[PDB]
Amino acid sequence: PPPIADEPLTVNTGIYLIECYSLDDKAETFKVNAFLSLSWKDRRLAFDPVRSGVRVKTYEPEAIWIPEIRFVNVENARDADVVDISVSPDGTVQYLERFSARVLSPLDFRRYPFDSQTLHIYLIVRSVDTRNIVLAVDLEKVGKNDDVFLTGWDIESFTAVVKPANFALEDRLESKLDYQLRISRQYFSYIPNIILPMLFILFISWTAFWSTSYAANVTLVVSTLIAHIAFNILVETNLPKTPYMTYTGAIIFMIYLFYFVAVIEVTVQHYLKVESQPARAASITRASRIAFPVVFLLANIILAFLFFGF
Amino acid sequence: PPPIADEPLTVNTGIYLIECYSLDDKAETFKVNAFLSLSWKDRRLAFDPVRSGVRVKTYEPEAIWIPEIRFVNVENARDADVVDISVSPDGTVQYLERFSARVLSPLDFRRYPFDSQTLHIYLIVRSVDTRNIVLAVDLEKVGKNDDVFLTGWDIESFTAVVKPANFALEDRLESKLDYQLRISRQYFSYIPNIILPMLFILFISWTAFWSTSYAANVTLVVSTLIAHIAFNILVETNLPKTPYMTYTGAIIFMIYLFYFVAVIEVTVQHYLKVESQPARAASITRASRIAFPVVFLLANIILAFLFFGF
Amino acid sequence: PPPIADEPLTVNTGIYLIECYSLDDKAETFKVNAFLSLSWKDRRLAFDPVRSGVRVKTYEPEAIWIPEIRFVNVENARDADVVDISVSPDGTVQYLERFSARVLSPLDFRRYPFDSQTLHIYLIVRSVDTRNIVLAVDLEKVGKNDDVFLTGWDIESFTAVVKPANFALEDRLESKLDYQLRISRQYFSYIPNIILPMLFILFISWTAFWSTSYAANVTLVVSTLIAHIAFNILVETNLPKTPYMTYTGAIIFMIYLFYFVAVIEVTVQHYLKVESQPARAASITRASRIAFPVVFLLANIILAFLFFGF
Amino acid sequence: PPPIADEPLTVNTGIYLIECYSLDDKAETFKVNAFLSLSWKDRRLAFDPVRSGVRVKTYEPEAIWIPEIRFVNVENARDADVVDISVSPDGTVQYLERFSARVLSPLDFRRYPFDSQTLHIYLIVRSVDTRNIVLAVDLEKVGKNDDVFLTGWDIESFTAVVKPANFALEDRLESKLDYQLRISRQYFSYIPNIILPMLFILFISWTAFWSTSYAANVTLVVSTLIAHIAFNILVETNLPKTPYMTYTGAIIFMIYLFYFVAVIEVTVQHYLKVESQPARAASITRASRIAFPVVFLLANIILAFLFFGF
Amino acid sequence: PPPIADEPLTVNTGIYLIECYSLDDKAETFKVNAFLSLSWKDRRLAFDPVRSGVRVKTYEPEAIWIPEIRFVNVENARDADVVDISVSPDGTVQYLERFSARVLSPLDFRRYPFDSQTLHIYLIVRSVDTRNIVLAVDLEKVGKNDDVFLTGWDIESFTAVVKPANFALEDRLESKLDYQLRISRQYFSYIPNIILPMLFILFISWTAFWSTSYAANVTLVVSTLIAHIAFNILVETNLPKTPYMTYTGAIIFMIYLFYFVAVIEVTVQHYLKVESQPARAASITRASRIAFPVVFLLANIILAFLFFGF
């Protein structure tokens, strides 16, 4: 029994983030728990101030006509409890619920180890014999407690796109609302656990440029190659199959190469030493101890610029 | 209280995909969230335009008789909320729900690393004292937002098989409807994380064809053998027990062989060098450094053709 | 309000398997989704054909008295939706539901890698002021679509034990019904991923019978010992703590021995070579290169027979 | 509307275990599925045998006053379905439900690999304007099918503590009932997969007492040290953070020491051999090959006695 | 239909912890199961002692007006069952429920291996046409059975902040109540499984200061480096991405350095021995065997103080 209008009914929205958590980098989701603020003028609900009780009159969701406001990008339907309906005298209704859903918005792991993300929540509304348009009421969009957690990420800013996008689906237009949560991953921890450890094994590998023994050199360069796989796999895990290349997956793959030519070298600095040509052999090894480190640091300036610098 | 017909009642179907996700290669499933469009002529519901209110009259699911449309290949029953019922004057009903289920359709990992899949959804309907036939109304089968995600896969095309298959179960025929989702796995990421890394260790292994030391050679060929197991196991995991052979599991198994004959060789290039016959020994090793690489690349053209080329 | 009989009321059962999946070898369970067919004569429900409407009269589960048919070996209560109740004129009721539960039946990993299993579903019924006996109606026990999946297993045959077992519990007898699903694990994949890889490392280990160097021999025999642990652990995982010995766990444990005596030997073929007694030393090593391989293949014929052959 | 007594109302309890499973050593829980038998005399429910229908009169849980019997040590509320209420003529009520909950009782991993445990279920009841006391009726406490599974454990005996413990909580006493399930872990499988494999690597380590080469000795003693970590970690996992020391965690830690002094030795049997003092060096190594094995077996008799023997 | 006051209505709270468990260090949560004690004077509920039945009159939650007391920091809504409502004659209501939720409170892994935590539960209440203030009634806040488990932690003290914080949200103030659970992690188990094992490999690494062989030294220092990664990764896991540095992650990272300079040394103690300068070479190695151990123990006193001592 919708409210009989003369034109499009405006439903006024606002989400107050109470809780954030379980951002799943693997599954591209995240859990949230907030308020849902809704307000619309239903004239049938007007009620003569002085003639009746107080300022406002509260109802049970049953009696009043209430808009169906579905969330778009949610795995399931949001488990919500109704906090309060307060019908103004003029007919203005003040609906308020506290929902709890897991939303589904994509993530760009382009600069993975260090990256900012922007999460979305959508809110559509299907129209019937009348049209509905949703729209934000910033005084409730302020959605953010000063205790919003979401570990591993720095929460930048929760806001909403004031202009709804009014689609037109299966005959009957709908009104969508974009709510936005910006976040910057807290890297750091990635250094002492991935970056640094992963580099040290790379360096230790090429102390085989100051060694003349093939045995201790295969042991040296190969043992570390393994550890880099241990790291490659470790990272490879908490991270989805992007169709594109990831910054840290680039450097981590480039590192595979330095282990190969490293071997190529030691394997060659051998076919020369035993080829009674140690004149040339220890010339190559002499070069390596400068080439490798330079071309690496060099290549990272190139690579890092390639990603962030562009 | 079914609508009294004169023949088979046609229920008109249509699924509008709103959300896709959680394709579980392991468990052969996937999660979806869409619209369910249903339409049927119930003559008892006809209602004299001018004599009553407006064009259409909305009901609560309770009052009207509504067909039971079960999904066939679903783990459980689909959690659905009813968006709208709109009874036309002639009696045409316009049912619409937004469901959310995990479907269960098989996958062919025949060309695993690079493979296309076709997902299914079924929709049956059991008949009573009357017969029901389902059938598509393409204007609602268009089921696909321009935001359909499903990570790691490229979504080809959502469509439906217009002709239902009318079984006959436990006395009382049913009408099934095949809805189809085609997808092509986004490989790529498999190269810098599996393919390439896995090859490099294979090459490094057989730099032992340019080495004359049994120690650094066992170290060489064996250490890498291990890493290939590390890779074999890693892949082996996110992948079910197919009764058939998988493309990447073929090459990954074929690789086990090159590590064996590699050892065979170095183990033999030793029983000869110490058998004061280094004439023959370094003849074998000289061969290996060409045989191995050729017969490999060679065998892949064979194998790859065997899979995709046929 | 049970139907007043003159003797034991027969409830007629039948399960039509629609979906199978999630056989958890670890947890000894498995998920199923089927029809539940129930039929019983309630004479109070008889209804004069010509005097009233049609052949049969459908009810809502509420009105009619309906038997409580609990599943015995289920983790929880089965999530079921009622498809149809159709009361015959004589009083014969035709109940039909589509349930979805995870059943709990044991598994014998005696011949693990290659083994057949028989799954169970139970269906009891508690009696009140009257006795109930359940019993199969094969025309609904046919429970099996030609699309029954259950990956990794070959589904042999779904059937039911026609004779119920009528216990007697807490005063008030019950009627249990054994439904049976036979399955044969699809091994195969176990070869190129466990069996073969696991053997190759065993062979490579004992190329140390054609080597005279203690260093490359410890490297050889030990490195592979490790990989066999990597395999031992890998298998050890997707497999519960049986109180008995498993076929593949037997060979995989027996393999541990060949790595020990292998070491014993190389460790001994050393205390002799350095004991200026290389006459004896290379006599032992000469033996090993025949003993080991024979006694192994030999022991497997013994072991394999021990399991399957008996 | 409680039954008006003259003193404390006795509610008669009894749990018939139908299903056991999912004992989580990690989380100290376990899942069960049983009957709940309750019986109490409500005199208002008396009903003149001959004047009315039959022996007993069945009700829907709604009508009758029924005691709230909460389980104490349960994660959540137990999902129960009501099987039957049968009011005797005198007023004796016969309540019966089939519940399904996960209980939470502690475990003592003191003798971990081989240990017996005793599981608990509690059943309290809060009193109102009258007092309630619970108490067992052994004829229903017999709770145990001859098919009670619970894999990996041998089920000893299900019984109940007949005397309730009547606390006094937030003003209003309660009656608690201790039900007990004794179980003995099926070890065995721990031998061929942990114990034995873990020992073999320990032995192989100290074949370095019959070797004079520092290289093959570091390779020997170190490689195995690693595998023992592989085992240490493997075990360390399916096992909670006890504040006390676990039997197998003791021996597994003690093993770490034999790998250290082993290294100490080989590292010392080197600083002597190169110190032109091989007289002393191969005296130490000669000792080790007897000391180590003895002091180990010796220390286990000590340790094992320390745990089980005391 | 709220109770008509003359000022702010005081609702009296109290949580009696019955069960604790599933503290997820990863997800910063934990599960609890307790009583919820609520009491408020609703004068409309007053009921003339002698004129009617007994002391108190019990209701079903339906009839009475009852405050909505939401938990703040909970993933979802708390699954609660209502134990008893007991309306006093004056109008004092005695509400009591037994809820079961997972709460979400942060954790400081600053001194991780050894650390105390303080868990929170919040309880807000939204006001309508009247104001509500919550407040503790210590006689029910005593929330703690003498069987409160929560494995791996020592439970210090459950208490509540008597003064509520009265916010002001979306127009309509609310009353929040801070309940506090203090806990001290049971470390210990971290020694024989992480600390000690992790140290032993560090020591064994630098027995390469008493060795003159580059091969057995790379083998020595590198093999252990790996194991420390095995440990680094193992710990790295059951532990979230803190933006700060963790005590055990500090020492575990500092350990990476001692493995690098260790290599630096052995790699240098080689470029000197082969540079016909063994005078200097074995001077460096002589230093190391004292420098390393000192500077380590030294650095830990520094580091440990840095964390706990400050």
Side-chain angles (χ1 to χ4, degrees), chain D residues 70 125-131 166-175, chain E residues 16 35 37 39 55-56 83-84 86 94-96 137-142:
Chain D
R70 324 181 277 101
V125 57
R126 181 98 172 181
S127 323
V128 199
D129 84 62
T130 308
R131 293 323 180 184
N166 303 55
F167 288 87
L169 227 205
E170 297 183 346
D171 268 286
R172 259 168 166 79
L173 67 76
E174 302 193 29
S175 209
Chain E
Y16 187 93
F35 273 139
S37 181
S39 337
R55 301 169 58 182
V56 299
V83 148
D84 204 9
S86 274
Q94 292 279 50
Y95 175 92
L96 179 80
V137 175
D138 325 55
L139 300 156
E140 279 79 10
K141 150 275 205 184
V142 276

Side-chain angles (χ1 to χ4, degrees), chain C residues 149-160:
Chain C
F149 209 162
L150 188 60
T151 24
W153 297 79
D154 282 317
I155 297 168
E156 253 72 54
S157 41
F158 188 56
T159 53

Side-chain angles (χ1 to χ4, degrees), chain B residues 9-75:
Chain B
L9 164 52
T10 272
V11 192
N12 289 281
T13 44
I15 300 175
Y16 187 91
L17 296 178
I18 300 152
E19 222 66 52
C20 265
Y21 50 91
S22 289
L23 181 143
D24 202 67
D25 297 85
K26 285 290 271 293
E28 305 259 56
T29 75
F30 74 103
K31 269 70 161 280
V32 60
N33 166 31
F35 275 138
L36 184 46
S37 181
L38 296 175
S39 336
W40 70 100
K41 98 180 71 163
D42 186 349
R43 311 197 183 278
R44 318 169 299 173
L45 272 297
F47 68 25
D48 48 54
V50 188
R51 317 262 63 171
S52 289
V54 302
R55 301 169 59 181
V56 299
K57 170 68 172 62
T58 48
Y59 294 82
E60 214 68 64
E62 331 310 325
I64 316 310
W65 169 99
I66 305 189
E68 268 142 71
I69 305 294
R70 324 180 278 100
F71 276 57
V72 191
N73 61 328
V74 186
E75 304 247 323

Side-chain angles (χ1 to χ4, degrees), chain A:
Chain A
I4 314 180
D6 312 286
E7 280 308 299
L9 164 53
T10 274
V11 192
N12 290 280
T13 46
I15 297 175
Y16 188 93
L17 295 178
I18 301 153
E19 222 67 51
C20 265
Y21 50 91
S22 288
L23 180 144
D24 201 66
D25 296 83
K26 285 288 272 293
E28 303 260 58
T29 75
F30 74 103
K31 270 71 162 281
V32 60
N33 167 32
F35 273 137
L36 182 45
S37 180
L38 296 176
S39 335
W40 70 100
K41 98 181 71 163
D42 187 349
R43 310 197 184 279
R44 319 169 299 173
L45 273 297
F47 67 25
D48 48 54
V50 188
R51 317 262 63 171
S52 289
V54 301
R55 301 170 58 182
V56 299
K57 170 68 172 61
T58 48
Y59 295 81
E60 215 68 64
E62 331 311 324
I64 315 312
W65 170 98
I66 307 189
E68 270 140 70
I69 304 294
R70 326 180 275 101
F71 278 55
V72 191
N73 60 327
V74 185
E75 304 247 324
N76 290 286
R78 63 277 193 352
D79 307 313
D81 299 348
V82 181
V83 147
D84 204 10
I85 317 90
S86 274
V87 180
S88 203
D90 44 299
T92 281
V93 202
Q94 292 278 49
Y95 176 93
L96 179 78
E97 74 180 41
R98 188 200 186 184
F99 68 107
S100 202
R102 80 181 275 181
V103 207
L104 174 43
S105 117
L107 309 160
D108 183 10
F109 308 93
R110 204 67 44 81
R111 311 183 193 177
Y112 164 75
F114 334 79
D115 76 317
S116 203
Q117 291 301 159
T118 167
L119 307 183
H120 299 273
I121 304 179
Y122 280 120
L123 278 61
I124 36 184
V125 57
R126 181 99 171 179
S127 323
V128 200
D129 84 62
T130 308
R131 292 324 180 183
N132 313 67
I133 287 193
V134 291
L135 223 161
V137 174
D138 326 53
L139 301 156
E140 279 79 10
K141 151 275 204 184
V142 277
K144 191 174 53 194
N145 186 205
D146 314 340
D147 305 343
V148 271
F149 209 162
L150 189 59
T151 25
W153 297 80
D154 282 318
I155 297 168
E156 254 72 54
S157 40
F158 187 56
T159 52
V161 176
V162 271
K163 330 287 305 177
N166 303 54
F167 287 87
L169 226 205
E170 298 184 346
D171 268 286
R172 258 167 167 81
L173 69 75
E174 305 193 29
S175 210
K176 191 204 274 170
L177 264 198
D178 191 6
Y179 281 79
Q180 286 172 18
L181 184 47
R182 273 253 91 166
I183 52 173
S184 265
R185 169 136 35 188
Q186 288 160 188
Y187 50 120
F188 174 73
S189 57
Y190 291 30
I191 304 156
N193 303 69
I194 295 294
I195 305 313
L196 277 258
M198 167 178 144
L199 291 156
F200 296 164
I201 68 156
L202 163 76
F203 302 153
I204 291 165
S205 101
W206 59 33
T207 70
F209 296 148
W210 282 258
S211 174
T212 192
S213 68
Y214 190 58
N217 279 0
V218 298
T219 291
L220 203 49
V221 184
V222 140
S223 287
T224 62
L225 180 57
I226 274 185
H228 179 255
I229 308 165
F231 281 91
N232 182 74
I233 268 179
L234 169 72
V235 184
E236 204 175 286
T237 285
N238 333 295
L239 216 37
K241 304 295 189 185
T242 71
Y244 52 93
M245 184 70 72
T246 163
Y247 169 77
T248 192
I251 84 201
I252 205 176
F253 168 73
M254 185 221 293
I255 299 289
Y256 270 124
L257 281 34
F258 283 72
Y259 277 89
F260 191 71
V261 306
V263 152
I264 289 306
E265 190 268 18
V266 302
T267 288
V268 141
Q269 168 222 318
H270 185 72
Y271 198 71
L272 300 211
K273 172 198 167 75
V274 302
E275 267 282 43
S276 292
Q277 194 179 339
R280 202 92 162 283
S283 180
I284 264 185
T285 311
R286 241 298 287 174
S288 294
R289 39 173 73 163
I290 284 296
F292 280 42
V294 171
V295 194
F296 183 67
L297 143 70
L298 202 71
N300 273 53
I301 294 156
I302 313 303
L303 208 59
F305 167 86
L306 193 51
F307 274 72
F308 309 57
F310 171 90

